[PDB]
Ligand binder design. Structure first.
Ligand SMILES: [Br-]
Ligand SMILES: [Br-]
Ligand SMILES: [Br-]
Ligand SMILES: [Br-]
Ligand SMILES: [Br-]
Ligand SMILES: [Br-]
Ligand SMILES: [Br-]
Ligand SMILES: [Br-]
Ligand SMILES: [Br-]
Ligand SMILES: [Br-]
Ligand SMILES: [Br-]
Ligand SMILES: [Br-]
Ligand SMILES: [Br-]
Ligand SMILES: [Br-]
Ligand SMILES: [Ca+2]
Ligand SMILES: [Ca+2]
Ligand SMILES: [Ca+2]
Ligand code: NA
Ligand code: NA
Ligand code: NA
Ligand code: NA
Ligand code: NA
Lengths: 597, 597, 597, 99, 50
């Protein structure tokens, strides 16, 4: 008899498809996640005390002493238990915030400011989201990020140096990185980083492969404060997709006729055609020069959960992203997949072709078929957004259940307390002795900057402070540093877009923001950019924006980008079983290789 | 021994969770979809011919005769086979468009306009997307829309009458429905519809339950051109979420301190805070009074696949939705879930609480937990967008594989051809005799309107035409009328938002667009609107916008809204298995009942 | 990844719970049931006849000869086949009753009385109920009762002696066991039983363990006619729960206030508060001194299925159980679980606490939870009643499919026929030679008693009869002796109550029935009774009531009590899988050990 | 050969009977239960307050104000969570009765 | 005093009551409840006796 397949009911075929996708995910296997060993390494310095200090772990929210170390190690050990359990009662039983007044129930803050504002506590953001399953994609716990840099490492010294230089450079305009007026500071930044082992010495055989991949070499004005995804280091700092508008409604080719929108100039003034309405690329303007958490008491109150969210001031209006601070503002409030949805809308409006390995991409006279729900605009619009929460669950597992890395503000706190104590001949937080020893010139600039801030904030003769100035009044979100929600979502979303569009398409005209006015100008860049390169650059812009705010380190961002790429690839692979058509997605990965899915 | 459960590996728990969700979906069972019987009912009038005519089926793209009937029934029968197969070669073998010129290869059109533009054909949009499976939610084919109204029915006569009155009313401003200058036309519309059996007589015992649910009664200025979802018929025509902006960055409460955005007024001038950038609610302005497909030759060319997309003209600038035509423009180009994402962004910026039956919604001093990836902003932003393509697959199955209902333009074509023939004592398309007989006063107004359009388009003495004027140069998309992609997505997306937010929250201040200027004014409405009501009204606005453009009938939209609600409910039910927390979504459904999921 | 469980649908969880309970029952395994070997042991005494006689098997209903032996062994062999098959046609094909008149179809009885009453036959009561499965608890056939005593055994001689002494003592009042007026008869009973090997010699090593457990020692006035469950031998003969009423509606503690029912005295006059109505503990009064089946012809007609049910006479009124006969009347018509439901109602009305190992039993200010459907009154009311039919199916399997032991009336028939024949120098039924030899003094008293009865019934000069006088006109029910429906249900029901209530609660005031009036009096008992002890005593009262009627032997009752306890325990164990709460039932078993379920 | 059934042990027949009854119950399928929508419809009348009032819900036992409306909406929301969980500690943590 | 209308929930249609009379006042709607005396025989009568 002739070999054959058999039909079954549609309902059974749907069931079997879903099981087959689950089986595909199961059969990938799983890998463990390894932490860097600091959590039980660092101990309470008191001779009669055995306990771990947890000084290199995220403990924002747990009550801290006057040096920034948690008061009771049980509070962190209980927090870790609650993270792994997810039980709501167990979470509500944790200690959050500083001691409360028995009579009134008020938290008593250290700072006159927090007390005068009558601030209450804020709580951890889904501390057990890393337990949540998902109907599609790799399970949150099936994949891993490598151990985070340790406080004593050359990598961390380099990372924290970079963050202080970004903080002190927040008023520098991207379009003026190479300008004479900025040469003293820009050359200082470049020279300071080039003076650090991480950047001036290569990795050595036998180093962890993850370190080898992410290690950076000589700092130049061309790579200063940039990421390392392919494409990010070519052409202007900012992706075209975060400053340019799009083709507008009314510009069209109809047979042999070209029509021109009466609003066509809006494309070059930062308006994205968003359906029949618009998105403006112009960002709100945080007050120039105003940074936060530069006073130790206010800093500790924030470490003790004081809710300063919403405390920033702004100038009137909005402008195309102009300064480093503006990119920090952009990433303070962006709505999840916002940057990538906006890029997607630009690509759609501009008529950038979809990946030619999808079906039905030919002229309709040849294939009799146009695209929309599958392989067209609606399909990519849903896919680019849906990957975001799957990527977040994976990075949340790394953040809370595995690594619990302290945020950069907390490292700056250790540095400041250490240096202040050392000036009185006392050793506090020797774990950061190397950073203090190597970053003297930078820390002296931070001290001057912080004194000016502290004076502006109403303290006429402030104590010296070497804290890392924060762009945001509340500093980091209420979750650990490693990895990043923004960077994992960037990695997943730009993976989708590079796969879905023909991302080898070359960009025709390259723009930057004008040095003198709030407008776009043609770039002097001589070279070719591609859609894929500019999408990778967009991911690096959002991810580094968090670093420029003071809330992530370089390694958090790069490792998160890789994690997001894995999540998106896994979703595409599992969804491949749902279609009858003959096609695949061509995906140029962050590593420069291509996978066909 | 004490009864117990056992642990297993995380990977097996993830697998088993996905299978359990698939099993839940399978165990819902499936229902058939019934068509209205027209496809083989209507026959070619030729005595020596044993073929159906397919006149009440979507046949856009197949070659039509001078009356708008397909030339070769095999072309439609092959199209149906290709719909059910999905095979790319089979699709490419179909007949699309009219005969082509041997020398140039170009289609030979009937109209001087189409020939002068050298238009090519456009193809069907994913004619087999209804075969695609999905990793989550009810399978596309497991659910049903009921039989569409038949051409001979009181329901259809009422629907098509309404669409002609909308077309002829395209320049009426929403704010002026009750204005003296519009009284003659508005009262004409109301009186004409009240003269039709569908609206002036109730359903009778024994009628299909779907008809009973969607049947409308007395037409009033207060319900004219509105939908029937609960909330749509109270207060102003347009949802607040399609005209108002949101709270802006810089407005916030920090403890006992109130901060005010320097651009706070932008909220009341149609700017949604979109992260740290903005969306403008102002829509592009299609040329007032210009409609399309009012000439029979141009109409037939469009029926024969002539690609007129992009042919519209616009005035400079943009304005808050002002006229009926502006809502048609809005839905011509909207990006999928755009309306509902925008509503979600307003609700988030305005600080509208999430559904209180979700976890962790209390003050953090009580629950020690804030929300983001689960039960917070990131969660709803992904969920509201991801449901869209699942809803589209379901409605695509109804559109192409089940019902294949002709679009309103095609019904208008049958009416025009019938009436023109009847005036010369010939019967053509007797199927629409009742509509022709009953809608004489409306058709006389359309005839006058069409003559003016045809003169404007360059024909100094046009043949009489009773075609339904289209807002879009290409008329409908290249897919059948029943149901609607816009309406199914509206149904799914507003279902998500009503479930995720506390959608009983009452709206504080109600706005409308000013009668005289392009600005918002306080409404005179006396009454209370809720978030759920205004989300339902938003769904009805986008859905009826398609009707006002000329591309759907009332029944397409309402039945599609119900189908989308089912898709979103099923996704929530299946996702409920992925969480460890104790919670549910409270969903107020379109039928007035609540489901807790 | 962190080990985890997965959720599944509620419907699948319910299914899996039910399967898990079935698996629990299956995995207990099964045990065989062994009969005592008599069925093929005793043979037809006729030298030319090989057949078994079946004289020690239940054959009530099959036609008997003038000596009480079945006429045709095939009738019993067919009955056994029908028992094992359950087929209704096969049952209807059996021979039931005596030869019928060919012309009229009437059964021709031996006795003028049965013929004059025109009695018809009664049939076996669910002879195949032992085949019925059940949705909960141990399957009927999975458990066993041990072999019944044989007719030649010391145990049987002791049992039948006891039953004759009970019959001849039916007019003795419980409250007067130790009274001078009864001393001659009571001492005769005690001395006669103490003269029998079973009671006066202990079991020996190597005897069956079941015999060792149930063997009784020295008879005293304190244990005469009592059972051996723990508690039955302490204090008054009758359980408090069969003579006392309960607290009445209107007696309550409301905060610090005590209210007293206007009907409070009803508690001490035998009224149980039954909701808002009442049950009276006063029993109908069968005619004192009137016994049945004392004439051989009437006896044989009953053995041949003559339906004498309903033939008893009664005195007017009702009284608290006063005499041995009254307890027999009580158990003639009691409705299944009646005694135990009534005890349950007393315990509930009196506010006896539930088992403290159940949930939510604390004051509500501590646990915020009262009990009703689970762990409260409604729960125990259903559980105590539902076990009854499961226990009956198990004992029915023992009665009909395994042991088929003859009822005591049939043993008395063998004894009478034997003794009458021996007086004429003939040996009939030598199987009961030991009983005849040892019970001469008792049988002489029965002869005198029977002659008086037979005279009263209208025979002026009756033949000598040594039949066991029956309390009921029809004698036993139409099913075998071993075990007992009453005793199996007693065992199951009191097991439930001891588990559900705090059955270590001590009884405050102990009552007995007054010697002179129909009222309760305070007992002179000095000692403590518990709820568990009085529930066990209640079970022994109902079970021994059947023996006092003449329809069971001691071993039938005790072994049935153990079987019922097993059934109830198995139901509790399987139901344990259905609850989410953390709790167990503490059950004091009949063997004096406790199981926690 | 003549089509036939086979016997099995009594214990397996009992097991299979119980499973067959469970399968019958499972194969009936399930239906949702819809509430009347009041629980989140009725709102606290306080203008500066974004909470439902729960006035049409059973709230006996939770502390009420002088009008009979619950004082703290969290008390009812916690009661609903405890209803769906069944956990004894969660039940004991509810607010029952007045100060 | 008004009947249910087409389109009302079927559960409402089934349980809706019409004109109130002394014969149906405070009664249920199960079949049998509205015929004969208000109270079931089974809540006031005794039974045949032993
Ligand atoms: Br199916
Ligand atoms: Br696989
Ligand atoms: Br994030
Ligand atoms: Br890969
Ligand atoms: Br695992
Ligand atoms: Br299921
Ligand atoms: Br659509
Ligand atoms: Br539903
Ligand atoms: Br279920
Ligand atoms: Br088991
Ligand atoms: Br019984
Ligand atoms: Br046991
Ligand atoms: Br077995
Ligand atoms: Br079944
Ligand atoms: Ca194509
Ligand atoms: Ca909270
Ligand atoms: Ca309690
Ligand atoms: Na766009
Ligand atoms: Na590419
Ligand atoms: Na709601
Ligand atoms: Na009671
Ligand atoms: Na006990």
């Amino acid at each position: 008899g002739i070999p054959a397949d058999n039909l079954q009911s549609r309902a059974k075929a749907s069931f079997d498809t879903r099981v087959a996708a689950a089986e595909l995910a199961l059969n990938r296997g799983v890998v463990p996640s390894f932490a860097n060993g600091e959590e039980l390494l660092y101990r309470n310095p008191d001779p009669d005390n055995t306990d771990p200090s947890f000084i290199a772990s995220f403990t924002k929210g747990l009550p801290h002493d006057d040096n920034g170390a948690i008061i009771d190690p049980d509070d962190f050990l209980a927090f870790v238990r609650a993270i792994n359990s997810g039980d709501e009662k167990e979470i509500a039983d944790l200690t959050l915030g500083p001691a409360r007044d028995p009579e009134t129930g008020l938290p008593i803050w250290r700072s006159d400011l927090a007390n005068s504002l009558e601030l209450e506590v804020r709580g951890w953001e889904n501390s057990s989201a890393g337990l949540t399953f998902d109907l599609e994609g790799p399970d949150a716990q099936s994949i891993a990020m490598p151990p985070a840099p340790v406080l004593t490492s050359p990598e961390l010294v380099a990372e924290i140096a970079e963050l202080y230089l970004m903080a002190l450079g927040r008023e520098i305009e991207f379009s003026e990185f190479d300008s004479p007026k900025n040469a003293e500071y820009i050359q200082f930044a470049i020279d300071q980083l080039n003076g650090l082992e991480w950047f001036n010495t290569p990795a050595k055989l036998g180093d962890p492969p993850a370190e080898i991949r992410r290690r950076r070499g000589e700092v130049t004005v061309g790579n200063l404060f940039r990421g390392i995804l392919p494409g990010s280091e070519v052409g202007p700092y900012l992706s075209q997709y975060i400053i340019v508008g799009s083709k507008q409604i009314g510009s069209a080719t109809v047979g042999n006729k070209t029509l021109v929108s009466p609003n066509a100039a809006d494309e070059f003034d930062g308006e994205i055609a968003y359906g029949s309405i618009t998105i403006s690329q112009r960002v709100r303007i945080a007050t120039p020069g105003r940074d936060f958490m530069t006073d130790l008491k206010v800093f500790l109150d924030v470490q003790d959960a004081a809710d300063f969210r919403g405390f920033e001031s702004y100038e009137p209006g909005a402008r195309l992203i102009r300064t480093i601070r503006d990119l920090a503002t952009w990433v303070h409030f962006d709505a999840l997949y916002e940057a990538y949805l906006n890029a997607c809308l630009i690509l759609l409006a501009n008529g950038v072709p979809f990946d030619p390995n999808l079906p039905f991409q030919q002229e309709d006279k040849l294939d009799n078929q146009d695209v929309f729900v599958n392989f067209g605009s609606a399909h990519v619009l849903s896919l680019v957004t849906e990957v975001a929460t799957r990527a977040l669950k994976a990075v949340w597992y790394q953040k809370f259940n595995i690594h619990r890395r302290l945020r950069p503000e907390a490292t700056g706190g250790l540095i400041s307390v250490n240096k202040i104590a050392a000036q009185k001949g006392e050793s506090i937080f020797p774990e950061v002795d190397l950073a203090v020893e190597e970053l003297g010139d930078i820390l002296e600039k931070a001290e001057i900057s912080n004194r000016k801030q502290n004076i502006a904030d109403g303290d006429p003769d402030p104590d010296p402070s070497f804290l890392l100035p924060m762009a945001f009044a509340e500093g980091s979100p209420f979750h650990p540093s490693y990895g990043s929600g923004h960077a994992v979502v960037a990695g997943a979303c730009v993976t989708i877009l590079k796969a879905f569009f023909d991302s080898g398409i070359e960009i025709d005209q390259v723009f930057e923001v004008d040095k003198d006015e709030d407008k776009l100008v043609k770039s002097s860049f001589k070279g070719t950019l591609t859609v894929a390169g500019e999408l990778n650059k967009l991911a690096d812009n959002i991810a580094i924006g968090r670093n420029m705010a003071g809330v992530h380190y370089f390694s958090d961002q790069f490792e998160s980008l890789l994690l997001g790429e894995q999540v998106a690839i896994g979703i595409l692979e599992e969804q491949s079983l749902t279609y009858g058509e003959n096609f695949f997605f061509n995906l140029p990965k962050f590593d420069g290789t291509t996978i066909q899915i």
